Amino acid sequence: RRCDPIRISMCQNLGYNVTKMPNLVGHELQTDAELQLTTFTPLIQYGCSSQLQFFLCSVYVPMCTEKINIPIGPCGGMCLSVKRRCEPVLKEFGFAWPESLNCSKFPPQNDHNHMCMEGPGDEE
Amino acid sequence: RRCDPIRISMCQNLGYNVTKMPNLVGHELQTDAELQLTTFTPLIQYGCSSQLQFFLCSVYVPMCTEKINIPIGPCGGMCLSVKRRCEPVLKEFGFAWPESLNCSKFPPQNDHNHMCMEGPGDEE
Amino acid sequence: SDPRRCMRHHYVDSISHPLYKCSSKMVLLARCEGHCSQASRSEPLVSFSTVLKQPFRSSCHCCRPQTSKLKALRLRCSGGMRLTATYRYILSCHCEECNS
Amino acid sequence: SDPRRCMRHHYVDSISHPLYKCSSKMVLLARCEGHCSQASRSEPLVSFSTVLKQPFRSSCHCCRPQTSKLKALRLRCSGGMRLTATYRYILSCHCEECNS
Numbered sequence A, B: 001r002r003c004d005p006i007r008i009s010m011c012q013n014l015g016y017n018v019t020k021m022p023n024l025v026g027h028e029l030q031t032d033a034e035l036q037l038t039t040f041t042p043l044i045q046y047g048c049s050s051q052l053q054f055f056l057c058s059v060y061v062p063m064c065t066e067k068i069n070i071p072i073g074p075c076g077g078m079c080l081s082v083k084r085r086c087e088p089v090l091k092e093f094g095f096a097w098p099e100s101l102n103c104s105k106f107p108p109q110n111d112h113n114h115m116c117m118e119g120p121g122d123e124e
Numbered sequence C, D: 001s002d003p004r005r006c007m008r009h010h011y012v013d014s015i016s017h018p019l020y021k022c023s024s025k026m027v028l029l030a031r032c033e034g035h036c037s038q039a040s041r042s043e044p045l046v047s048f049s050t051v052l053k054q055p056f057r058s059s060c061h062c063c064r065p066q067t068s069k070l071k072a073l074r075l076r077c078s079g080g081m082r083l084t085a086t087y088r089y090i091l092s093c094h095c096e097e098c099n100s
């Protein structure tokens, strides 16, 4: 009911069924978010990190649940573990690491107080 | 090499890969044996016994193995367990139980001395 | 990217003490689910003892947590009582053999 | 009639004593093999002890022998020794849970 189904194939079939717009970034519609991801598609191929794609989906189509009205995204540690692997390569393609993926914003860990997903890649 | 593959769909995909003509009955060619089985097809539907089909395949396309040159078929007990369930119904269709399926011929049990397959249905 | 595959699934529940009356606390969790690819089997074994056991050797790939970090949290129970609960967040699923 | 399905498979081997030198005897046997349909999983568990264990509850349907009749046979070993071996002919396969 409350949440809504993922419509991006790319992000389909990871941990979780469902998300809710509007985006953490502030995307209004999955389609638009779809557009952004595509841009990262070459990077994904390069396979800087295995966990990359999942992470991005986490940000762009955050998990959602009927249990509570807030959205669920990635913990920092995960991103960092990711960020380090790909910060450079993105520098190739002459690309700054985007502020939207600023790893300060994400909570440190997963707890009652704050809920975010983690991966085997980790950090403080 | 020595044995040869089952070619009858009906008998395909039971315990064992392979058989060898000519038939216990004395069928020369799987095709011909195929013909006979078909006749039993209505009976099978009636589901006198679950183990029926397997049994018949056992007789008509006996197992085969490279390990030794003899053929492998069903033990009696199995047949009987089968024979009783379907002897009657075959009487319907006004049908004698055929001598080819005479349950005396099959060995009593499975042993070094004699090798035959058994089923959960059983008898002396 | 086969949905059948053994994999990590995410969801939220609320841990509340079974017997004591307490305030629930909502937390997020992960579980392992899918179909391990590798067929399963068992085949018979031979003993020259007058005692057997030993009935068969089998294999079977279940789907289970590769990597799991312990967590915990405290609960406030009516009257004085305040309690602590502990469990395992699951970082990675794999397929492993059922009996080792 | 799905070849994937858990099921009984037939074959012949020849039992011969591992260590003693003996004459082999050829016998026919059956084994269980396929893919149990029911997905597998494990999911985390909660302890209010300072001791945990208890890490998860899981389920997993392996494919195993439903019904198996004991057999045996005797072997003649060089010099005096004549020996007896025992095993299980498998009449039926099913899918059951890995841990019960």
Ligand SMILES: O=S(=O)(O)OC[C@H]1O[C@@](COS(=O)(=O)O)(O[C@H]2O[C@H](COS(=O)(=O)O)[C@@H](OS(=O)(=O)O)[C@H](OS(=O)(=O)O)[C@H]2OS(=O)(=O)O)[C@@H](OS(=O)(=O)O)[C@@H]1OS(=O)(=O)O
Binding pocket: A112, A113, C072, C073, C074, C075, C076, C082
């Ligand atoms: O638990 S909270 O998320 O609400 O965080 C602090 C508030 O909880 C208290 C006591 O109430 S209760 O925890 O709900 O039972 O603090 C206690 O909670 C925090 C959070 O952790 S926990 O998993 O909920 O127990 C503990 O922090 S920690 O264990 O993660 O390190 C508190 O210990 S501490 O602050 O880190 O030292 C724990 O004990 S204590 O009560 O703090 O002594 C309340 O206490 S507070 O932190 O001093 O404010 C907090 O207020 S609230 O009314 O529960 O929201």
Ligand SMILES: O=S(=O)(O)OC[C@H]1O[C@@](COS(=O)(=O)O)(O[C@H]2O[C@H](COS(=O)(=O)O)[C@@H](OS(=O)(=O)O)[C@H](OS(=O)(=O)O)[C@H]2OS(=O)(=O)O)[C@@H](OS(=O)(=O)O)[C@@H]1OS(=O)(=O)O
Binding pocket: B112, B113, D072, D073, D074, D075, D076, D082
């Ligand atoms: O074993 S046989 O299939 O070859 O059958 C009988 C022949 O084996 C002997 C002894 O040689 S041996 O068995 O090869 O070691 O008889 C023995 O074998 C039979 C068959 O069973 S078994 O699984 O092979 O042991 C036994 O029968 S039974 O255990 O199934 O009941 C014999 O016992 S008995 O005849 O039933 O009483 C068993 O012992 S005994 O040697 O018979 O005393 C030879 O003995 S014989 O049966 O008297 O002829 C048989 O000759 S052969 O040279 O092994 O072929």
Ligand SMILES: *[C@@H]1O[C@H](CO)[C@@H](O)[C@H](O)[C@H]1NC(C)=O
Binding pocket: A102, A103, A104
């Ligand atoms: C990201 O933003 C944080 C706070 O908004 C700031 O401290 C930092 O300079 C930015 N860049 C980072 C974390 O790389």
Ligand SMILES: *[C@@H]1O[C@H](CO)[C@@H](O)[C@H](O)[C@H]1NC(C)=O
Binding pocket: B102, B103, B104
């Ligand atoms: C089958 O043949 C056996 C021996 O060849 C004979 O004793 C019997 O009368 C026949 N009929 C049966 C077993 O029903």
Ligand SMILES: *[C@H]1O[C@H](CO)[C@@H](O)[C@H](O)[C@H]1NC(C)=O
Binding pocket: A017, C009
């Ligand atoms: C959606 O699928 C997920 C896992 O695939 C499952 O947890 C959830 O129950 C499904 N939706 C419903 C209504 O069951």
Ligand SMILES: *[C@H]1O[C@H](CO)[C@@H](O)[C@H](O)[C@H]1NC(C)=O
Binding pocket: B017, D009
């Ligand atoms: C034929 O398949 C059976 C079971 O499906 C297997 O035991 C056998 O090994 C197969 N043939 C070969 C050459 O492996």
